[PDB]
Write an enzyme that holds these catalytic residues in place. Sequence first.
Site, PDB file in Angstrom:
ATOM      1  N   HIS A  29      -3.234  34.746 -32.551  1.00 20.57           N
ATOM      2  CA  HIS A  29      -2.685  35.180 -33.973  1.00 20.57           C
ATOM      3  C   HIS A  29      -1.148  34.820 -33.819  1.00 20.57           C
ATOM      4  CE1 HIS A  29      -6.695  37.213 -35.008  1.00 20.57           C
ATOM      5  NE2 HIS A  29      -6.561  37.479 -33.933  1.00 20.57           N
TER       6      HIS A  29
ATOM      7  N   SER B 217      23.749  14.511 -29.143  1.00 21.78           N
ATOM      8  CA  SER B 217      24.881  14.831 -29.592  1.00 21.78           C
ATOM      9  C   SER B 217      25.828  15.519 -28.459  1.00 21.78           C
ATOM     10  CB  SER B 217      25.120  15.537 -31.022  1.00 21.78           C
ATOM     11  OG  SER B 217      24.388  14.897 -31.991  1.00 21.78           O
TER      12      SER B 217
ATOM     13  N   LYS C 138      19.421  20.640 -27.583  1.00 20.94           N
ATOM     14  CA  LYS C 138      18.426  20.033 -28.758  1.00 20.94           C
ATOM     15  C   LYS C 138      17.737  18.962 -28.374  1.00 20.94           C
ATOM     16  CE  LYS C 138      17.982  19.783 -33.687  1.00 20.94           C
ATOM     17  NZ  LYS C 138      16.724  19.794 -33.827  1.00 20.94           N
TER      18      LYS C 138
ATOM     19  N   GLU D 143       5.728  14.667 -31.467  1.00 24.48           N
ATOM     20  CA  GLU D 143       5.679  14.319 -33.034  1.00 24.48           C
ATOM     21  C   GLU D 143       4.845  12.973 -33.219  1.00 24.48           C
ATOM     22  OE1 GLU D 143       9.886  14.184 -34.149  1.00 24.48           O
ATOM     23  OE2 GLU D 143       9.874  16.497 -33.782  1.00 24.48           O
TER      24      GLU D 143
HETATM   25  O1  LIG Z   1      -5.665  40.865 -32.128  1.00 24.06           O
HETATM   26  C1  LIG Z   1      -6.350  40.602 -31.225  1.00 24.06           C
HETATM   27  O2  LIG Z   1      -6.187  39.480 -30.582  1.00 24.06           O
HETATM   28  C2  LIG Z   1      -7.699  41.302 -31.043  1.00 24.06           C
HETATM   29  C3  LIG Z   1      -8.135  41.421 -29.767  1.00 24.06           C
HETATM   30  C4  LIG Z   1      -9.248  42.334 -29.403  1.00 24.06           C
HETATM   31  C5  LIG Z   1      -9.518  42.455 -27.605  1.00 24.06           C
HETATM   32  O3  LIG Z   1      -9.333  43.527 -26.812  1.00 24.06           O
HETATM   33  O4  LIG Z   1     -10.072  41.478 -27.263  1.00 24.06           O
HETATM   34  C6  LIG Z   1      -9.861  43.079 -30.271  1.00 24.06           C
HETATM   35  C7  LIG Z   1     -11.094  43.981 -30.098  1.00 24.06           C
HETATM   36  O5  LIG Z   1     -12.273  43.114 -29.738  1.00 24.06           O
HETATM   37  O6  LIG Z   1     -10.996  45.065 -29.957  1.00 24.06           O
HETATM   38  C8  LIG Z   1      -9.233  43.120 -31.887  1.00 24.06           C
HETATM   39  C9  LIG Z   1      -8.362  42.221 -32.039  1.00 24.06           C
HETATM   40  C10 LIG Z   1      -7.846  42.335 -33.450  1.00 24.06           C
HETATM   41  O7  LIG Z   1      -8.146  41.243 -34.211  1.00 24.06           O
HETATM   42  O8  LIG Z   1      -6.921  42.961 -33.929  1.00 24.06           O
HETATM   43  O1  LIG Z   2      23.052  12.560 -37.957  1.00 23.16           O
HETATM   44  C1  LIG Z   2      21.859  12.297 -37.593  1.00 23.16           C
HETATM   45  O2  LIG Z   2      21.509  11.156 -37.977  1.00 23.16           O
HETATM   46  C2  LIG Z   2      20.776  13.678 -37.207  1.00 23.16           C
HETATM   47  C3  LIG Z   2      19.700  13.080 -36.107  1.00 23.16           C
HETATM   48  C4  LIG Z   2      19.060  13.953 -35.606  1.00 23.16           C
HETATM   49  C5  LIG Z   2      17.946  13.611 -34.652  1.00 23.16           C
HETATM   50  O3  LIG Z   2      18.170  13.657 -33.491  1.00 23.16           O
HETATM   51  O4  LIG Z   2      16.678  13.688 -35.084  1.00 23.16           O
HETATM   52  C6  LIG Z   2      19.120  15.364 -35.998  1.00 23.16           C
HETATM   53  C7  LIG Z   2      18.172  16.251 -35.865  1.00 23.16           C
HETATM   54  O5  LIG Z   2      17.530  16.758 -34.702  1.00 23.16           O
HETATM   55  O6  LIG Z   2      17.734  17.197 -36.709  1.00 23.16           O
HETATM   56  C8  LIG Z   2      20.288  15.602 -36.808  1.00 23.16           C
HETATM   57  C9  LIG Z   2      21.180  14.835 -37.273  1.00 23.16           C
HETATM   58  C10 LIG Z   2      22.117  15.380 -38.313  1.00 23.16           C
HETATM   59  O7  LIG Z   2      23.498  15.263 -37.687  1.00 23.16           O
HETATM   60  O8  LIG Z   2      21.962  15.688 -39.132  1.00 23.16           O
END
Ligand SMILES: O=C(O)c1cc(C(=O)O)c(C(=O)O)cc1C(=O)O
Ligand SMILES: O=C(O)c1cc(C(=O)O)c(C(=O)O)cc1C(=O)O
Lengths: 455, 455, 455, 455
Positions: free
Chosen positions: A184, A314, A320, A327
Amino acid sequence: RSEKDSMGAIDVPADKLWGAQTQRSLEHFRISTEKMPTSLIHALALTKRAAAKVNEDLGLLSEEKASAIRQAADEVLAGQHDDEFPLAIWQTGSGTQSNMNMNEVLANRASELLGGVRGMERKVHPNDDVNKSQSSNDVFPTAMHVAALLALRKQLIPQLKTLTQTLNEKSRAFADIVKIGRTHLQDATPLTLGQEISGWVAMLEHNLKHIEYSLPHVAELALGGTAVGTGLNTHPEYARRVADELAVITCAPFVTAPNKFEALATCDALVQAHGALKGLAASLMKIANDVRWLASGPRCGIGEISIPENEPGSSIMPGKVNPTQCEALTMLCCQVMGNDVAINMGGASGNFELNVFRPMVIHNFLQSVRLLADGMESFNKHCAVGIEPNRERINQLLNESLMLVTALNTHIGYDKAAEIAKKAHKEGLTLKAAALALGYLSEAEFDSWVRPEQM
Amino acid sequence: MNTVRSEKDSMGAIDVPADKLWGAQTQRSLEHFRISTEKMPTSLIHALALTKRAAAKVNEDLGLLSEEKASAIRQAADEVLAGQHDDEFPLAIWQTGSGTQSNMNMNEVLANRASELLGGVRGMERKVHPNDDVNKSQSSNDVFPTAMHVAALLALRKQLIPQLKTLTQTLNEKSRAFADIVKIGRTHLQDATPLTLGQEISGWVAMLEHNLKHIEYSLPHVAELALGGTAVGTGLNTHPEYARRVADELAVITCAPFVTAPNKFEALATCDALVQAHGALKGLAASLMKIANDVRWLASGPRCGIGEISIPENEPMPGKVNPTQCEALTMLCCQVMGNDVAINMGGASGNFELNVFRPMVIHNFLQSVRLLADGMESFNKHCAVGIEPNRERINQLLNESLMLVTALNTHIGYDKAAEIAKKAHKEGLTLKAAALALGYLSEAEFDSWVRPEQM
Amino acid sequence: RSEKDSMGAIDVPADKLWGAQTQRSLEHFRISTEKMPTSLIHALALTKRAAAKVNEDLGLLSEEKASAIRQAADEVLAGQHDDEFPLAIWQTGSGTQSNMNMNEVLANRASELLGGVRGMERKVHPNDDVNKSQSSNDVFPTAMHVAALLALRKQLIPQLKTLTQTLNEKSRAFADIVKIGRTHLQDATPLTLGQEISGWVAMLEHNLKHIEYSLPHVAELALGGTAVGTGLNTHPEYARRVADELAVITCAPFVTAPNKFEALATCDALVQAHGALKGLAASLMKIANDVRWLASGPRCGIGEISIPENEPGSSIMPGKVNPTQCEALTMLCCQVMGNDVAINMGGASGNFELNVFRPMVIHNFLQSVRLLADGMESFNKHCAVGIEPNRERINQLLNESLMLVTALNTHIGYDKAAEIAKKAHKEGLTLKAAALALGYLSEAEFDSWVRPEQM
Amino acid sequence: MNTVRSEKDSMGAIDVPADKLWGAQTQRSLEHFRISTEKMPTSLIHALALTKRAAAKVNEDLGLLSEEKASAIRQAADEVLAGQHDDEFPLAIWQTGSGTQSNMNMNEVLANRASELLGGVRGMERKVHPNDDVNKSQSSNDVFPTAMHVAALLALRKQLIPQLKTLTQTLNEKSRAFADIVKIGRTHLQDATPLTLGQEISGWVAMLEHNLKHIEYSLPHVAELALGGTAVGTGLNTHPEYARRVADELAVITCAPFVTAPNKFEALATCDALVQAHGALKGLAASLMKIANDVRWLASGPRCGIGEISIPENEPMPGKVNPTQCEALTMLCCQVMGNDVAINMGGASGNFELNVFRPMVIHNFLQSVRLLADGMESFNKHCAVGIEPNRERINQLLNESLMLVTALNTHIGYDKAAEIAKKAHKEGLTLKAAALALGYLSEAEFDSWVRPEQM
Ligand SMILES: O=C(O)c1cc(C(=O)O)c(C(=O)O)cc1C(=O)O
Ligand SMILES: O=C(O)c1cc(C(=O)O)c(C(=O)O)cc1C(=O)O
Ligand SMILES: O=C(O)c1cc(C(=O)O)c(C(=O)O)cc1C(=O)O
Ligand SMILES: O=C(O)c1cc(C(=O)O)c(C(=O)O)cc1C(=O)O
């Protein structure tokens, strides 16, 4: 040059090997930019090659012509005539245009190969010779299956195995690095990074068997069904023989379809095979997302792992590293999902003896294979092989979560153990700081009790 | 009943209708997720009960549960299975993505009922406890996924498959029966070369047979149970033999080949088995859509359509018989198509150790199985078994077509045959009329030469 | 040649105008065959052109460089540099690669235009000059909207109007031809062919207004939002000015997005605009199906209308006119449906400040526009303008249906009138033959009562 | 009740449970379409009743129905509207594609009840008749489509829109409240330039505002009613003023701007208005999906996620708060996506004068409206109103990031700033630590220079 057909004559560019039917279609189907992909062109050429051989064997075609056609076919396979197929995917639903395109190109070239000329005075005839014992109806579906099975066997499966092998090595390499689990999106109990990665591995292994289960149906060929599936105007041994020939020259287990009516009236094998592909797309989407979230940061995300920086960055912004390969992979996965819907509508829209949504179905299918295969290769080489754990970050997070209080329960009442967890949480302290301040234990006994490496 | 009962949980006390068996957590979910009208399917509820019943038996076997308490829980589950508590599960599908709330719903109902069965009372002074007893050795995280597969596998094996086999048998009988009936083929919706009705129907048979194999191939992955993986898949807080034992128990009481999932991380983090299994279902939907469409077009009329076959008129414009069963079937096939997209999106959205799109996924999956199984059963008994050929209409169509001219070729040559075809086409005459007008043959000769049976 | 960036130097093909960043991407993103479409390349060039002008106006760029960049841009628009953009659609989700591709091509060419050379010793710099006051983050989304709005306004809408005008003329031309209506594929009450066609017209008219409703949101531009939408590192008037410039040179009502966060973090305008397109696809699919079913035959279908035969046919098979334009249109309609799903998943997958599924979204969007526009044009010219009624067939069917018995009711009791309908149906006679044989009336009074032209 | 009643239709007599108000036709459908569990939505049932209520009033006005009989039918409908006969409509969604069976269901229930209201008895000796009276001046073909739009328009205007406006208001209030809170931006999941929480939330606001406009644009097409078109759209067997009058009555009693459809052929042959309206809904689903995801990622933790905000914990691992409302919302958004595909397929499948995929289409459409309306209402009251910023965590994140180095440029130059960024990044230090280690500035200067508020 002046090429002609039943509707009369029409001028075709002199330096081209195609005929009148291809030229008319070129003027009637000017829709978008998508043309038949190379893999389909090759499959179509291979289908004509095998048909020429069998026709020769049954005595339906002279050796002189049979061999010339096969030679023209091999030239297409060699990449010598790529520019000779200008037809759009958006043509007649049976793919008749593209069948004629191959017949004309092959006939014209085969004529030259026999000391003849291209055009109206050709020695080899497109319909009478190259399309002998065939129909656009059973040839196109055959080309579709040849292209599909070969793309799956030669491109997709090998790339899938390679990626799995890499992730498998990674799983093993990180088998001892304990990290915080998340459900979650919330902090949960620990598991090792190796275990998390092994989950990705099993996903890929399962997908492989699913894809393999779809192959047999795709291996069934329509050739021999002729116009409506009855096989009228064909030698009884034609269908089986041509299937054999095709199996021999491609080294793939092609067989003649047990029911030609099903082979002609539907695209079922592809609708099913593609189902396994969208299944693979959903798995890859999840794997790609885990990688980019785990590598998010460098300072305000999760940052448990590091991936290779492939693009220049950069100078004033070190750290970064955008997960570009992730992607690219997620984007193509969405594409496969969409391609499936298009294929489904087309596969469900057949009428009577023939499904006429074929060009669109094969266009989407081959694109999905291309996307998935190249996508895994790129993800593998430019990302997966380079996944490394940021051990420090991993431990910092592990020793910062309240989830470890569980280890204390076995050594102190549920409420007392939970009591320090309440303080740590409330005060913003760590389990140890809270445990020591609450005086419930000493550093020595704490560390000996909270053993994350023991789950 | 207006009278309430005070139930309580970690968050405190809350009122529950006195006449109901659920507890505090179920009441909170009920008031927090008032979204739409979809609730858990009866099949899913029963699967959850089977899971708890198995968990109890094995917990007893490992001495983790007192024989008395175990048998009580086991007996309470059986009542659920017998349909005695269908009104005790009011939670919407649109709840927490792990299905935790519904797991708790079953825990509370089973506890409150087992308590009574032990001579105790329901409520906050019950002999059997929801978490401590009924949810012993389990986690919501691994219980829901398990229930999902139990429900999925049983619905496929007991509802879907049998109905598919039955429809297939019926169509196969119709195929053999109309084997000698020659009719006009249709490609691109245009008249084409002849084929028998039996051959056309054999196509539907082969489609259904191919679909069965594809469905069978998706079963072993669905048979894999996540039970034992606990919270994140590591199996922390579980007896080492639990996973295997509980899977064996389930197998025994259901007679289905259930097995524990080899990789628990893949089982908890994804719905891959269902994404893939549904891929085969959307494939069957595409095939069914085609068959239903063929049937309704072939029965269209009675005077201005195709009218080659007649179907049973099941409801109350004299000969106007609407193909209603065909309309229900095509409608549900579109539903399965949309359901696939919803499932794909949820399947591709897992994050780290757990996929939290489960209720929505199982909701769509079980609906598709109900739709396909019931749809085929309905179509079969209310349409398929009664399909009859309109022999007179069929023969009228054949004799009015220009597609039979091919039989004249061997007797009078292609040129004269084509001339007759052209004349008949241009003047709106039958082949015989044109042939006779020209004097190329006698009526007797026409009758002896053009035998559609030798297509 | 040797081009370099932060990561160092790399060799680029001498005869090319692109730089190092484009060359690296070319080696890292070798996925499939889809590249950016020409319309997007132009939009990107237009975006750089307008940016150069405004930067010059605000005194951020020297006139010498500003004008040179705009000149290099116009060359791209003129189709002089098509081969200079080899990047795949499947790149980084923000479209950064393609932004750099344009910056490098424009900088290099702009250098030559200033008496300089391409490469490392260039006068105009890609980042410092061409990308001044911009970011890949706000430039790509801007290019997407420019391309989308222009494609909708210049290609799609005009083709939609033209097709409607044609069908509208047809409606009017066939306003008096009475034919048998069909519901559930069954014979129903009559309507005129003109009325049936007017239904297609209204469908197209409605779609037009729906498409127009989506334009305003698409007209909103992200330019000025910069990296995260705040507009940091930009002149306050930049955003509005550049929007104006773009409006001026394209003659489209572009405006600066009121909320840049929404503009950067989502693809909502396109998700919505595409919804209108899939709406258009469903309408066209229905129109295309009606046309091909109505033209089905020539002897064993409906055959109420005739369409032009565009492809050459068999001499021995006159009459078989496959509705190829209809098959091409239905196929592309299925494609748009699929493209919508891909766009939806991408549009729903944005995270925080930036949606990174952009290249895939624009790829699908522009393809849908191309498919629909060219599809309508082709359908119009090669089919719609040539729709002609087979008056004889139409009347034959009309005078063969039992549906006309209704006219008799007003002149004879429901049961008596229905009585002849039972006989005609049972005996296979026509309403008149049955009416006369049953002696319920005379030919004269029958014909005067059964007036189909009076509904 | 075991006691039956003998009801009858054109096909004969059939037993109906004595305690039920339906008739022979409803009983036949009930036994012929036992498919799955989906029945007509309560909203659709009420819309059908409103349609019959309006048809009666107008029939009375045109003197086609006796005042007594009309008022009785009208009064019986009101009981349906009041929820007094919800158990009288057992027909499945999976019935005849025109919705004829459900129209008859309403006709039979309304007749049997109106009869009693007139002092008569239910059954085959009723005072009011299903077809002759309740279905007077109507057709199943034009009644169902009308009910579809009535239900659709009212659900959009009374359920969906109000909830959308409410959520928007809440988010807008949160936007203004956190306007001064500066946080780290994230693009590609990587740390980026700062922005205030209020600005990030303003993005969600603008998304919701844009969605409202799109939804509003789809309403006028949905307001068009097919009532009056009868069987095929011609309006045969109807008073010339009926269509307009009945549409006016509906408008009056619902207060919704209903109008008769200008083209009845478009209204009967397609579901275009719904295909388009649902396009706007899938758009809202994509936006909601993004907002819900942002919220859950931003609240992830508490120790190993992002933890920038805290959401209300609504149900009973100390600080482990699962974003359940977010999980319900994202799940239902996937559902709307799949529903769109089912609707598209049905919308594209109309044939000639009537689209027979209506029940399935309205089923999916109304479900999406319920899901979106209730989902937003739930998310708003159980999450949105209580969103709070974790000011300490936010500030910790800002101070640990390398993204603030930009503020140093104007004071010490770009080269030194980049050096500090590189050092801090390579050695795992904060910007201040690196700056001080180098001695490029004093701590006081750092504190005065790097003011994230001036981003
Ligand atoms: O949040 C969790 O990941 C989660 C995990 C368990 C667990 O111990 O496996 C249980 C349960 O079966 O008691 C309940 C939850 C819940 O949804 O709140
Ligand atoms: O100048 C650009 O062309 C640019 C390129 C990238 C990239 O590498 O994609 C990012 C980014 O990672 O968000 C930010 C900028 C920016 O200075 O706004
Ligand atoms: O698409 C065509 O025009 C076509 C082409 C061929 C062929 O290539 O021979 C045949 C055949 O003789 O099988 C039939 C058709 C057809 O309409 O079904
Ligand atoms: O489903 C039906 O059986 C039906 C019922 C009616 C009706 O409302 O009585 C009509 C009509 O006269 O408009 C049309 C049809 C039809 O089949 O097209």
